[PDB]
């Protein structure tokens, strides 16, 4: 039934709104300057970073920035976890499988949602209270600079798809419920949940993007691309805490990356 598929899409969207403070709609309302509340503080260099410390936080710089990305990711993992628990059937899955789905899915989701806060010139940080330029981040000394850039590279391509929060809510759910993650114990229940979410995504895209028949197929490929994107991320990261003495990694992040073959 198509009616139930729309009810599901709406349920996911509502849960998405409850789990993620800054939505793509609100992000772009700020990015384009259509909002009335205080625009974000722009950080484009060492000097500006220093000045905006109080407006974003409630080689020491490159490391300082890296640390910021770590704290945001930790927060993001928790927000995504709350979202996952709202997907029908998820909390009833074997608990270790839930852990596995999150372990291999969080970073792909982080990349996806990160795009919502980015444009070609920069990224919104601190719930939209700050804006750090892409060129400033890309200029960070090795190997940090090449750690930031790929996220923008992906975002530019992904945002060309013009998905909205309603599209994204289902897209993210589909990714989390991937029955082929390494080490899953009970595959079938996960595959059945995903099959239904995929049908929900297909209908959502057909109705919401009537003039772009290729969208569903492209998102499926994007899901495959995200895995390759995440592997490269994990590598470049394991070389930082491998070539930077002064580099501590948050426990939660160490857990996710550990044994992430």
């Amino acid at each position: 039934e198509s009616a139930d598929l729309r009810a599901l899409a709406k349920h996911l969207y509502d849960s998405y709104i409850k789990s993620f403070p800054l939505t793509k709609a609100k992000a772009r309302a700020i990015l384009t300057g259509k909002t009335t509340d205080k625009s974000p503080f722009v950080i484009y260099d060492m000097n500006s970073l220093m000045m905006g410390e109080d407006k974003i936080k409630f080689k020491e710089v490159a490391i300082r920035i890296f640390q910021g990305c770590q704290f945001r990711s930790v927060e993001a993992v928790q927000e995504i976890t709350e979202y996952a628990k709202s997907i029908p059937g998820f909390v009833n899955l074997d608990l270790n499988d839930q852990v596995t789905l999150l372990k291999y899915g969080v970073h792909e989701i982080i990349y996806t949602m990160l795009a919502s806060l980015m444009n070609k010139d920069g990224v919104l940080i601190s719930e939209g209270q700050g804006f750090m330029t892409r060129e400033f981040l890309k200029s960070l000394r090795k190997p940090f600079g090449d750690f930031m850039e790929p996220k923008f590279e992906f975002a530019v391509k992904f945002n060309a798809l013009e998905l909205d929060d309603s599209d994204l809510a289902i897209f993210i759910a589909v990714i989390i419920l991937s029955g082929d993650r390494p080490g899953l114990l009970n595959v079938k229940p996960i595959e059945d949940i995903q099959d239904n979410l995929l049908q929900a995504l297909e209908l959502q895209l057909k109705l919401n993007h009537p003039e772009s028949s290729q969208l569903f197929a492209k998102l499926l490929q994007k899901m495959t691309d995200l895995r390759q994107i995440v592997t490269e991320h994990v590598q470049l990261l394991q070389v930082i805490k491998k070539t930077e003495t002064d580099m501590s990694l948050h426990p939660l992040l160490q857990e996710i990356y550990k044994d992430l073959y």
Binding site: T81, E82, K85, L95, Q98, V99, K103, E255, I256
Partner: peptide, 11 residues
């Protein structure tokens, strides 16, 4: 993965 475990069970 006890941390992910804990987050999955709270709330």
């Amino acid at each position: 993965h006890k941390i992910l475990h804990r987050l999955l069970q709270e709330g």
